[PDB]
Design a protein around this nucleic acid. Structure first.
Ligand SMILES: Nc1ncnc2c1ncn2[C@@H]1O[C@H](COP(=O)(O)OP(=O)(O)O)[C@@H](O)[C@H]1O
Ligand SMILES: [Mg+2]
Ligand SMILES: [Zn+2]
Lengths: 529, 196, 526, 172, 93, 193, 89
DNA sequence: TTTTTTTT
C-alpha cells in the first residue's frame, strides 16, 4: 500500500516539477515565489492537472480526502528541493484548487455529492473567529514516560490508547509546548437570492477554512467556493449526521490614488468654474435648487477641522437642513456620490452598542424628514452633532438634514433650505417612458472629494478674516437697530473653508468669504420662513 | 518659514518626477507653478532688502559684530536654500524636456514657461545640429532598442494613405498588413501608424 | 535538565551583568524586612521587570530563546533569579509558614517586543508557545479566587510534615503530569495525615477577557478578544473597561476535539495568555518631578497666579474670566470636613450657568471635562435619574451605578440641565447635598458615596434670559435646588459692537491657529 | 549627494530639535516672531540645511543640535530587536539619508554600525520581495509600507530589473 | 405567458397627459410613481385581455383609474375643481 | 536626455542578447557558397568573411551567432548545439553545484541567454529531448538563485567575489547589489572622520 | 429565529412571492411595510446576520378611515393615518 | 408562551 501512496506522491511531484506551458514551469515558479514571500501554499488549476495526466485528477476525485494530503506532501518535498540546498524546517503547505467547472446549486446538494469535490457559490452570511488545529503534537506516555508524537491532517484520529513502549488505557498526553497548530475558521453560506426557489427560505450551509485560506473574506460577500461535500457527527434523528463542506479554495466574486488621479484632480482645480461644474453635476435630474446644490457641495467637502493647543477642537463637519420626494432623491444622490454616507429618514453573542446614528462616522448621515424623524428624540442628534458625540459617541460625520413638512435643532444645524417647470416634467415622463419600454462622473466626484479632503486643509486669509469680522459685527449691529451669534459665524467660516477646499487653495480668499456669506444668507432667508 | 515655499516647490518637483517615471509612456509635464516661483522670488527680494537694511545698521554699528554677523549669515543661508530649491525644480523640468526632445522631437507648450519653451527649441536645434554633419551616418535620434529582427510584419494601426520609401511605396490602408524590414518602417511605427 | 541548569547559570551571569536588577531585588528584600519590623498596625511582591533589551545585548541567544521558547527559558530564568535572591537574602528567623512558603521571585519584561507585540485580532496560532504582548480593553473580569499549589500535611503519630505540590496548565509554563488534586489523607507508610492549612500554600487565580481596541476594530466585525490568566500580584491590577497592554506566554490547552470522548472532533484547542506582566494604558494620573514641584512652588510666589491660571483655562473661549476663576476654584475643590461624631461637611464646589444658545457654556463644560483629571459628561435629556445616581439591576439583583456614583471623588458636568426631568432633579438633590446616594428599591437597601463635584449648564426658561423678568421666572429650577447648588452664573449675550468685534477677532485668530509642524493646506494628523 | 538631487533637498528640508547658545536680537522670526529677540538656551527645532551651518558657526556655536527622536535610544533598541518589523517609514520618510547626514555631522560609530545592520537586514527581505514576481500580496504590501523612500526607490529598480528579466526570458 | 409591450408612440401622449396632470396638481400633487402606476395598470389591462402589446385603450383606462384615485384626495376641498379639470382626461374620450 | 533612465546604470536583457549574438558558433550549412575552381559574396566587416564565401553543405564551421540565426530563420542553416548544452554536461554541472554549495559552477558566461535563444529558434537541432534540457536548465537556474541569496547574506562594503556567476544573472542583480554596496560604503565613510 | 441548534424562519411578507399579500387593520408592521414598499425585499440582521429576503409580491390593503365613518372633509390621507410615503407607494 | 412583581 504505502508504495502506492509514494507512487501518487511521486506523480504529483513530477506534475509540479514538469508541468510546463510554452516555456515556463508555471507551478515551479509559483511555488518558488510563494516560498519567497513565506506563503507556504500552492494554488493549482484542475484543468492543468487533467492536462498533465487525467489519471491523477480522477484518482483525486475518487478519494479527495486522502489524495489531497499526499499532494500537499509532494508540494512540501518540492519546496524543500527548490528552496533549500540538498546536502547543505518548512511547514506543511496548503493546496488551493480551482475547478472552474459547472456549479451545483446549494439546494441541489445531497447525498450524491458526499465526499465529492464540489464547486458552487453563494454569499457569505457570517464569519467565525479562528481556532487552533493541531498539525503536530508532542505526546508523553503517562506512566512509562515514553516520548512520542502525532502528525494530524485536517481531513477525514485520536490519542493512542496503547503504550507502544499494562501501562494504561490512555497513558499518552499532549505537550502543548512542543506541539504545533494552525488556524481554522468557520463560515456560513446561503444560496444566491436568485437561486432561492419561489417563496422559499434561502438555504444555508457551514464551512471551515484553515492555513492561508483563513480570513480571506468577510460576511455579506458574494463568493464562489470549491470543497468536498463533508458530513460530521455533530453532538447536537437516528443515523442523522450534520453536513458541512471543507473549503478547498475560494474565489471572490466582488473582490491609494495614483499619479493619474492626482493629475486629474489638479486639472479639475485648474478649471475656474470647477465649483459651478460641481453644482451643475449634483443630482442633475433635480433641476433648479441651485443653492441646494451649493450646500450639498459644501457639506460633502466638510471643513478644516482644527484642534487647539488647549485641546478644544474646531468642528469641520458642516450640517445642512432642507425642506416632497425631491429632497429624497437629492439625499439618495448625495449618499450615492458620497465617499461614505448614512441615509435613513428616521426609521432607524452578547453585545450592545449605540443606535444606527452612532455607527455612522466620517462621510455623511442623511435623513429625508426630521419632521418625521423623532426616534430617540432630537436630543440624541443634538449631542451627536453639536458635540460630535462607555456611552460616548466617538463619531464625526456631516449631517444632511431635510424635511418637507414644517428652534433648538435649527440652531444646531448649520444651513437651512427648502424645496413649476412643466417642460422638465415632460422630459422626466419621457425618460420614465424610455426606461420602461458640466458633466462629471459620480465615481470621479467621489475620488476628487475624498482626495481633496485628504490632502487639502484651507485656512482663512487674514483679509478674509477682517472681511468676516466686519460682516459679522455689521450684521449684529443691523439686528440691533432692527439673532446672529458665534454659531452662525462658525458656520460661515466652515463654509468658506469648504469653498477654499474645493479650490484646493491652502489659504482662503475673500471670494470664498463672499460666496460663503451669500450661501449662508440662503439659510437665513429660509430661517425667516 | 522662508524654506516652506521651497519645500512645497521641491515636493511638486518630486511628484512630477514620479509622474513621469511611473508612467511608462511619455507624459506631458505639469503646469509651471509660476505662482510659487513668484512668491519665492518675492521672499528672496524681501531678504535682499533685509540684508541691505542690516548693512545700514552695521554702519550704525548696533552690535554688528555678533548680531549683524548672525543675521547676515542666516539671511544668506535662507536665500541659498531657496536658490537650491528653485534650481532643482527647474533642472528637473529641463531634463524631462530634454527627454521629450530626444524621444520624439528628434524623431503641451502651454505647460512650459516661455523661457522653458525657448530652451526646448534651442535644445531641438542643438540635437538636429548634432545628427547633421559628422556622425550623420548613424541616426542618434534612432531607437536605442537593438535591431534584433531584420524583417517584421506590420499592420497599419491608422490609415494615412500611401507613403514613399527609398525604393518603394507603402499603401497605408486600415487593416492591411505589410511584411517589410523593420528599419524602413521604424519611424512610422514610432509615429503610431503601424502596429507590431 | 543540563540545558536547564546551563540556562540557570547563564541568567545568573546576566543578573551579575546588571547589578541594577540585584540592587532592586535587595531594595525589595530590605523594604519588606523593614515593613515587618515595627508594624504598629504593604509588602513588595517578589517580582522583577528585566529589560528585554538588556538580555538581547548580554546574550542574544538566551534573549531569542526567551522570546520564542519561553516555556524552556523563563522557568530556569526565574529559578536563577529566586536562587540569587535567596542566597543574597538574609531570610532571618523565617516563620514556620515562611519556611514552607517557598515564595519565589517572578520575572517581567519592558518594551522592545517587535513582532512579538500584537493585538487580540492580530494574534495567530503560530505565536503559540511564544512570549508575546497585546493591547486592548479589559472586559468580563472574573473574581479573585484561591488556588491550591501545596498541601502541607502533618503526619500525626509520627511528628512529621509531608507536603505535596500541585500542577496546573496555568501554574506551570511547561506541561507536567496533572496532579490528582487530592489532599494527602494518609501517609504512604499508613499514618493518617492532617491538612495543615496556612502552612499549605495557595495562590490567587484571576481570569479576564481583553478585547481588541474598538478604535482598531474593523468595520462589520466583532472585535476579537483573548483571555489572560492573571495570578498572584498580577491579580486585581485592573478592572473592566481598562485599555491596557499585557505581556504573557500565548499558550494552548485542552484536547480541541482530539480526545477520544469527542465525537464530532470539529473543534479547536483552547488557547490562553499566561500574563507575566501588565502595563496599564491610560491613553488618568498626572506625574510630578522634583523640578516640576520646585517650578510650582516658585509659581505660587507669583502674586496674581490665581488670575494667570484662570486665564490659562478656556483660552479659546473669551469673556467669562470670572466663570474661569470659578471653574479654577471648583477644580481645586476645597476642604471637606467630617466631624468625629459622623457629620459630613461638603467641601466641594458646584458651578452652573444659565446662558443663551451658542453661549459656549456647553463648550466651556467640554473644556472643563477634557482638562479635568476624572470627569463625567452628560446632558439633561441624555441623563436619567437612576442612570445619573444609580439603577437597581437584575444582574442576584445588583445596583447599577449612575453617573454620580462614577467619579465619586472626581468631577461631573451636565448639559441642558434645565431640560433635565424634574424627578431626576430631585434625585440629584440628595446626591449633591448629602454627597452620598442611597437606594432602597427592589428590596435592595444601599448607600453609596456620591461626593463627586457637579457643574451643570442650562438655558433660561425663555431661551433668552430676560433681565427684566425675575431669575425665578428665568429659572425653571426650584430655588431649593438653586440654593442647594452653589454658584449661579447668569451669562447673557449683548450687542456691544466693540465686544462683538473683540470676540469676532478672537474666534478668527482661533481658526487661524497653525500646528507648528503643519502648514497651510496640510490637514492635521499674558 | 547631488546639489540638484530632489531627495537630498527634501531631506535637508527636514528640521531637527536645537537650542541656541546666544541671545541674538532680530532673529525671533525663527520663532515666527520677528519682533522678539532670540535668547540663549532657546530650545528651537530648525531645518537641517540651516541647523547644520548654525551648528558649524559660532568657541561656542550659535546653536546646538539636540539628539532627535529618530535617533532616540528607543529607536536603536527597536532596530536591534527587529529590523524588518520596524516601520522606518512611520518614524520618518527619509530616515536613512538623514542618518548618514547625522553621522557625517558627528562621527557616531555605534550609530553607523546600527544603521549598517538595519540596512543589510531590511535589504535581504526587500530583495526577497522584489524577486517574488507575480506570474500585490499583503505581506509585500506591508513591507513596502514600512519601506522608506530610498528603500522604495531601490525596490522599484530591482523589481523592474526582475520583471524585464522574466519578460525577455519566458516570452520571446 | 402575457407580457404587455408598452406603445412608445402612445407613450408620447402618456407623457403629455402626465405633464397636464402635473400642471393641475400644481394648480392644487402628482409624482412619477403615479406615472409608473398608470403604466403598470395599463399593462394589467392588456394582460386581462391576453394582450402582450399595450394599446391606447389600456392607457385610457389606466389614465381614468389613476385620475380617479387622485380625485379621492381632497373631496370637499377641490373635488369639484378636479372634476371640471379632468372631466375630459378621465371621462372624456 | 540622450539615455533613458532604465538604461542609465545597466543593460536591458536586449543588450545582453546583442552582446551574446556577437559571439561565434558551430553550424552546419545547408548551402555550398564555396565556389569550385572549375557571384554574390558576403564581404562583411565586423566579422570574418572568409568562411562565409566558403560554405559547403553539411560541413561544420563557425559564424557569428546573429548570422547563424538569420540563416536558421531560413531553412538554409542548422545550428550545432554547444557541447556544454548536453544532458551529460548539465547533469555534471548540477552534481558539481550540489557538491560545492559555496561555489558556483563553471557554466559559460552566456549560458542562460544562449540556451534561451537556441530553445526558441533551434529546437530542431537539439539532439537530446528538448523538454529535459529545458528542465535541467531551470533546475540550474533555481540552484544558482539560491546560492545568490546565500551570498547576498554576506553583503559587505569591502568587496564581493561572484566568480563563475553568469552574465545574465549579473545583469539581473546589478542594480540592487550596486546600490546596497553604495549605501553601506557611504555609511561607513561618514563614520570615518 | 429559534433553535432547530439555531435556525431562522421567514415571514408572511416573504412567503408572498409574486403573490398578492392581503392585509388590513392598519408599529413594527408599519416599518416592515416601509422597507417592503421601498424595495420588494426584507432586510434582517437577526442573530447578527445581516441579510435580505426578496418578497417581490403584490400587496392589498384595507382599513376604516381614521377608525370611523369616512369624512369627505379633509383629504383621503387625512381620512386615514398612513404616512404619505405609504400612500404613494 | 404565559403569568408576574417589580423596576425602568
Ligand atoms: N464668548 C465666547 N468666546 C468664545 N467662543 C464663543 C463665545 N460665545 C460663543 N462661542 C462659540 O459658540 C459656539 C457654540 O456654543 P455652545 O457651547 O453651543 O453655547 P450654548 O451651550 O450656550 O448653546 C461654541 O463653539 C463657542 O466657541
Ligand atoms: Mg452649547
Ligand atoms: Zn507507557
Amino acid at each position: 500500500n504505502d508504495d502506492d501512496n509514494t507512487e501518487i506522491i511521486k506523480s504529483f511531484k513530477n506534475f509540479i516539477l514538469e508541468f510546463r506551458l510554452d516555456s515556463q514551469f508555471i507551478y515551479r515558479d509559483q511555488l518558488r515565489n510563494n516560498i519567497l514571500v513565506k506563503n507556504y501554499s500552492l494554488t493549482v488549476n484542475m484543468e492543468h492537472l487533467i492536462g498533465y495526466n487525467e489519471d491523477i485528477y480522477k484518482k483525486l476525485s475518487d478519494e479527495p480526502s486522502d489524495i489531497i494530503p499526499l499532494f500537499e506532501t509532494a508540494i512540501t518535498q518540492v519546496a524543500k528541493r527548490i528552496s533549500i540546498l540538498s546536502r547543505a524546517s518548512l511547514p506543511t503547505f496548503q493546496l488551493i484548487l480551482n475547478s472552474n467547472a459547472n456549479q451545483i446549486p446549494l439546494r441541489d446538494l445531497d447525498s450524491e455529492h458526499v465526499s465529492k469535490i464540489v464547486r458552487l457559490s453563494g454569499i457569505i452570511i457570517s464569519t467565525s473567529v479562528l481556532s487552533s488545529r493541531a498539525t503536530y503534537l508532542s505526546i508523553m506516555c503517562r506512566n512509562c514516560r515514553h516520548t512520542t508524537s502525532i502528525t494530524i491532517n485536517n481531513f477525514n484520529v485520536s490519542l493512542p490508547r496503547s503504550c507502544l513502549s499494562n501501562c494504561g488505557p490512555d497513558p499518552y498526553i499532549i505537550i502543548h509546548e512542543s506541539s504545533k497548530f494552525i488556524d481554522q475558521q468557520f463560515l456560513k453560506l446561503q444560496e444566491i437570492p436568485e437561486l432561492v426557489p419561489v417563496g422559499e427560505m434561502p438555504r444555508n450551509l457551514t464551512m471551515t477554512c484553515d492555513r492561508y485560506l483563513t480570513n480571506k473574506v468577510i460576511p455579506g460577500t458574494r463568493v464562489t467556493i470549491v470543497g468536498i461535500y463533508s458530513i460530521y457527527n455533530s453532538k447536537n434523528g437516528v443515523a442523522i449526521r450534520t453536513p458541512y463542506i471543507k473549503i478547498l479554495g475560494i474565489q471572490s466574486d466582488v473582490e491609494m490614488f495614483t499619479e493619474e488621479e492626482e493629475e486629474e484632480f489638479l486639472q479639475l482645480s485648474r478649471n475656474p468654474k470647477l465649483y459651478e461644474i460641481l453644482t451643475n453635476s449634483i443630482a442633475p435630474s433635480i433641476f433648479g435648487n441651485e443653492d441646494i446644490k451649493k450646500a450639498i457641495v459644501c457639506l460633502l467637502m466638510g471643513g478644516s477641522k482644527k484642534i487647539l493647543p488647549d485641546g478644544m477642537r474646531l468642528r469641520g463637519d458642516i450640517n445642512v437642513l432642507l425642506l416632497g420626494t425631491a429632497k429624497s432623491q437629492l439625499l439618495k444622490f448625495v449618499e450615492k456620490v458620497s465617499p461614505i454616507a448614512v441615509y435613513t429618514s428616521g426609521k432607524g453573542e452578547f453585545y450592545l452598542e449605540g443606535g444606527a446614528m452612532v455607527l455612522a462616522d466620517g462621510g455623511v448621515v442623511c435623513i429625508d424628514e426630521f419632521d418625521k424623524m423623532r426616534d430617540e428624540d432630537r436630543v440624541a442628534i443634538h449631542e451627536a452633532m453639536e458635540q460630535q458625540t462607555t456611552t460616548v459617541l466617538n463619531s464625526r460625520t456631516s449631517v444632511l438634514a431635510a424635511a418637507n413638512p414644517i428652534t433648538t435643532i435649527l440652531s444646531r444645524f448649520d444651513m437651512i433650505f427648502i424645496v413649476h417647470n412643466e417642460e422638465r416634467d415632460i422630459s422626466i415622463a419621457n425618460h420614465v417612458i424610455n426606461i420602461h419600454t458640466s458633466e462629471i462622473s459620480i465615481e470621479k466626484m467621489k475620488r476628487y472629494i475624498t482626495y481633496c479632503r485628504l490632502k487639502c486643509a484651507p485656512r482663512l486669509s487674514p483679509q478674509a478674516a477682517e472681511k468676516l469680522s466686519s460682516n459679522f459685527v455689521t450684521i449684529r449691529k443691523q439686528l440691533l437697530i432692527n439673532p446672529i451669534t458665534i454659531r452662525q459665524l462658525e458656520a460661515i467660516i466652515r463654509i468658506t473653508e469648504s469653498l477654499a477646499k474645493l479650490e484646493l487653495s491652502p489659504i482662503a480668499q475673500e471670494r470664498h468669504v463672499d460666496e460663503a456669506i451669500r450661501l449662508f444668507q440662503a439659510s437665513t432667508m429660509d430661517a425667516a420662513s | 518659514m522662508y524654506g516652506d515655499l521651497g519645500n512645497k516647490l521641491v515636493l511638486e518637483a518630486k511628484r512630477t518626477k514620479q509622474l513621469y517615471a511611473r508612467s511608462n509612456q511619455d507624459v506631458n509635464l505639469p503646469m509651471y507653478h509660476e505662482d510659487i516661483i513668484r512668491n519665492i522670488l518675492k521672499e528672496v527680494s524681501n531678504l535682499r532688502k533685509n540684508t541691505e537694511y542690516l548693512k545700514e545698521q552695521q554702519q550704525l554699528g548696533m552690535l554688528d559684530d555678533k548680531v549683524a554677523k548672525c543675521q547676515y549669515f542666516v539671511t544668506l543661508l535662507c536665500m541659498e536654500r531657496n536658490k537650491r530649491c528653485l534650481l532643482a525644480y527647474q533642472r528637473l523640468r529641463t531634463d524631462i524636456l530634454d527627454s521629450m526632445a530626444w524621444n520624439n522631437n528628434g524623431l503641451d507648450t502651454n505647460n512650459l514657461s516661455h523661457q522653458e519653451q525657448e530652451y526646448l527649441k534651442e535644445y531641438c536645434d542643438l540635437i538636429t545640429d548634432l545628427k547633421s554633419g559628422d556622425l550623420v551616418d548613424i541616426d542618434l535620434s534612432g531607437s536605442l532598442v537593438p535591431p534584433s529582427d531584420v524583417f517584421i510584419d506590420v499592420r497599419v494601426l491608422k490609415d494615412a494613405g500611401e507613403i514613399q520609401t527609398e525604393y518603394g511605396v507603402f499603401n497605408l490602408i486600415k487593416d492591411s498588413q505589410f511584411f517589410v524590414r523593420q528599419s524602413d518602417v521604424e519611424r512610422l511605427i514610432q509615429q503610431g501608424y503601424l502596429q507590431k | 535538565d543540563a540545558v536547564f541548569g546551563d540556562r540557570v547559570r547563564r541568567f545568573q551571569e546576566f543578573l551579575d551583568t546588571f547589578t541594577s536588577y540585584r540592587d532592586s531585588v535587595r531594595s525589595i528584600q530590605v523594604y519588606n524586612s523593614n515593613n515587618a519590623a515595627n508594624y504598629n498596625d504593604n509588602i513588595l511582591p517578589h517580582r522583577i521587570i528585566i529589560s528585554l533589551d538588556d538580555l538581547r545585548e548580554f546574550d542574544r541567544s538566551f534573549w531569542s530563546g526567551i522570546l520564542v521558547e519561553p516555556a524552556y527559558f523563563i522557568p530556569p530564568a526565574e529559578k536563577a533569579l529566586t536562587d540569587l535572591a535567596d542566597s543574597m537574602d538574609d531570610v532571618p528567623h523565617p516563620n514556620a509558614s515562611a519556611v514552607s512558603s517557598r515564595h519565589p521571585w517572578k520575572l517581567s519584561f519592558k518594551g522592545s517586543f517587535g513582532a512579538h507585540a500584537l493585538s487580540p485580532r492580530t494574534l495567530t496560532a503560530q505565536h503559540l508557545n511564544k512570549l508575546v504582548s497585546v493591547e486592548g480593553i479589559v472586559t468580563k473580569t472574573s473574581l479573585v479566587r484561591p488556588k491550591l499549589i501545596r498541601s502541607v500535611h502533618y503526619a500525626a503519630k509520627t511528628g512529621r510534615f509531608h507536603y505535596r505540590d500541585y500542577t496546573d496548565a496555568t501554574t506551570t509554563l511547561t506541561t507536567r503530569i496533572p496532579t490528582p488534586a487530592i489532599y494527602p489523607t494518609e501517609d504512604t507508610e499508613g499514618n493518617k495525615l492532617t491538612t495543615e492549612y496556612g502552612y499549605s500554600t495557595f495562590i490567587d487565580h484571576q481570569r479576564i477577557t481583553v478585547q481588541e481596541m474598538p478604535e482598531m476594530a474593523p468595520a462589520g466585525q466583532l472585535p476579537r478578544s483573548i483571555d489572560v490568566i492573571l495570578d498572584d500580584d498580577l491579580v486585581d491590577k485592573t478592572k473592566p473597561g481598562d485599555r491596557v497592554n499585557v505581556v504573557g506566554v500565548f499558550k494552548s490547552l485542552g484536547a480541541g476535539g482530539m480526545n477520544q470522548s469527542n465525537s464530532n472532533t470539529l473543534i479547536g484547542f483552547k488557547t490562553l495568555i499566561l500574563g507575566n506582566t501588565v502595563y496599564p494604558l491610560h491613553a488618568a494620573r498626572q506625574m510630578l518631578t522634583d523640578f516640576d514641584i520646585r517650578n510650582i512652588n516658585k509659581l505660587s510666589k507669583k502674586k496674581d497666579i490665581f488670575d494667570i491660571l484662570s486665564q490659562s483655562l478656556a483660552p479659546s473661549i473669551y469673556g467669562h474670566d470670572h466663570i474661569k476663576k470659578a471653574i479654577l476654584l471648583m477644580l481645586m475643590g476645597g476642604v471637606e470636613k467630617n466631624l468625629e461624631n459622623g457629620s459630613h461637611l461638603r467641601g466641594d464646589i458646584n458651578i452652573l450657568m444659565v446662558g443663551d444658545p451658542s453661549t459656549a457654556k456647553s463648550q466651556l463644560l467640554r473644556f472643563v471635562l477634557n482638562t479635568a483629571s476624572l470627569a463625567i459628561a452628560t446632558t439633561g435629556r441624555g441623563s436619567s435619574g437612576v442612570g445619573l445616581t444609580a439603577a437597581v439591576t437584575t444582574d442576584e439583583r445588583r445596583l447599577e451605578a449612575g453617573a454620580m456614583v462614577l467619579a465619586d471623588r472626581g468631577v461631573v458636568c451636565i448639559d441642558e440641565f434645565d431640560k433635565m426631568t424634574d424627578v431626576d432633579r430631585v434625585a440629584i438633590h440628595e446626591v449633591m447635598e448629602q454627597q452620598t446616594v442611597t437606594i432602597a428599591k427592589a428590596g435592595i437597601h444601599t448607600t453609596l458615596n456620591a461626593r463627586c463635584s457637579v457643574i451643570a449648564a442650562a438655558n433660561p426658561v425663555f431661551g433668552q434670559y430676560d433681565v427684566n423678568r425675575d431669575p425665578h421666572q428665568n429659572i425653571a429650577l426650584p430655588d431649593s435646588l438653586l440654593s442647594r447648588f452653589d454658584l449661579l452664573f447668569v451669562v447673557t449675550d449683548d450687542i456691544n459692537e466693540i465686544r462683538d468685534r473683540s470676540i469676532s477677532e478672537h474666534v478668527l485668530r482661533t481658526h487661524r491657529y497653525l500646528p507648528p509642524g503643519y502648514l497651510e493646506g496640510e490637514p492635521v494628523r499674558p | 549627494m547631488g546639489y540638484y538631487d530632489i531627495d537630498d533637498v527634501l531631506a535637508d528640508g527636514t528640521e531637527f530639535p536645537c537650542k541656541f547658545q546666544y541671545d541674538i536680537p532680530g532673529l525671533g522670526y525663527l520663532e515666527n516672531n520677528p519682533g522678539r529677540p532670540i535668547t540663549k538656551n532657546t530650545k528651537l527645532s530648525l531645518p537641517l540645511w540651516l541647523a547644520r551651518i548654525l551648528a558649524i558657526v559660532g568657541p561656542v556655536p550659535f546653536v546646538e543640535l539636540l539628539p532627535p527622536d529618530m535617533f532616540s535610544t528607543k529607536v536603536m533598541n527597536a532596530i536591534k530587536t527587529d529590523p524588518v518589523a520596524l516601520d522606518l517609514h512611520s518614524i520618518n520618510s527619509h530616515f536613512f539619508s538623514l542618518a548618514i547626514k547625522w553621522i557625517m555631522l558627528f562621527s557616531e560609530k555605534e550609530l553607523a554600525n546600527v544603521v549598517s545592520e538595519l540596512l543589510l537586514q531590511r535589504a535581504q527581505e526587500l530583495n526577497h520581495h522584489a524577486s517574488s514576481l507575480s506570474i500585490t500580496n499583503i505581506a509585500t504590501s506591508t513591507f513596502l509600507l514600512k519601506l522608506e523612500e530610498m528603500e522604495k526607490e531601490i525596490y522599484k529598480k530591482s523589481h523592474e530589473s526582475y520583471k524585464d528579466t522574466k519578460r525577455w526570458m519566458f516570452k520571446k | 405567458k402575457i407580457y404587455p409591450k408598452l406603445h412608445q408612440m402612445d407613450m408620447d401622449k402618456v407623457s403629455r397627459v402626465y405633464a397636464d396632470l402635473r400642471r393641475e396638481s400644481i394648480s392644487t400633487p402628482i409624482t412619477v410613481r403615479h406615472l409608473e402606476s398608470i403604466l403598470r395598470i395599463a399593462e394589467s389591462f392588456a394582460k386581462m385581455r391576453l394582450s402582450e402589446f399595450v394599446s391606447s385603450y389600456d392607457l385610457d383606462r389606466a389614465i381614468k383609474v389613476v385620475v380617479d384615485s387622485f380625485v379621492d384626495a381632497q373631496k370637499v376641498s377641490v373635488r369639484r375643481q378636479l372634476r371640471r379639470s379632468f372631466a375630459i382626461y378621465t371621462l372624456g374620450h | 536626455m540622450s539615455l533613458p533612465a532604465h538604461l542609465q546604470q545597466t543593460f536591458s536583457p536586449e543588450e545582453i542578447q546583442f552582446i551574446v549574438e556577437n559571439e561565434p558558433i558551430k553550424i552546419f550549412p545547408r548551402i555550398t557558397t564555396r565556389q569550385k575552381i572549375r557571384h554574390t559574396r558576403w564581404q562583411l566587416i565586423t566579422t570574418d568573411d572568409k568562411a562565409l564565401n566558403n560554405m559547403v553543405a553539411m560541413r561544420s564551421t563557425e559564424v557569428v551567432l546573429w548570422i547563424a540565426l538569420l540563416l536558421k530563420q531560413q531553412s538554409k542553416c542548422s545550428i550545432v548545439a554547444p557541447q556544454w548544452l548536453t544532458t551529460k554536461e548539465l547533469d555534471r554541472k548540477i552534481q558539481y553545484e550540489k557538491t560545492h554549495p559555496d561555489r558556483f559552477s563553471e557554466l559559460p558566461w552566456n549560458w542562460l541567454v544562449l540556451a534561451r535563444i537556441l530553445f526558441n529558434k533551434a529546437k530542431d537541432d537539439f539532439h537530446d529531448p528538448i523538454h529535459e534540457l529545458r528542465g535541467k536548465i531551470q533546475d540550474l537556474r533555481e540552484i544558482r538563485q539560491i546560492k545568490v541569496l546565500k551570498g547576498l547574506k554576506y553583503l559587505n562594503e569591502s568587496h564581493l567575489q561572484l566568480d563563475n556567476l553568469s552574465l545574465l544573472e549579473i545583469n539581473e542583480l546589478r542594480p540592487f547589489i550596486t546600490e546596497i554596496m553604495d549605501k553601506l560604503r557611504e555609511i561607513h565613510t561618514a563614520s570615518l572622520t | 429565529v429559534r433553535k432547530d441548534e439555531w435556525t431562522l424562519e421567514g415571514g408572511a411578507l416573504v412567503l408572498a412571492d409574486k403573490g398578492v399579500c392581503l392585509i388590513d387593520e392598519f408599529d413594527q408592521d408599519r416599518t416592515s411595510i416601509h422597507e417592503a414598499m421601498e424595495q420588494q425585499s426584507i432586510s434582517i440582521s437577526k442573530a447578527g446576520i445581516v441579510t435580505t429576503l426578496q418578497a417581490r409580491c403584490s400587496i392589498i390593503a384595507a382599513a376604516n378611515p381614521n377608525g370611523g365613518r369616512y369624512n369627505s372633509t379633509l383629504p383621503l390621507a387625512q381620512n386615514v393615518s398612513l404616512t404619505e410615503p405609504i400612500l404613494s407607494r
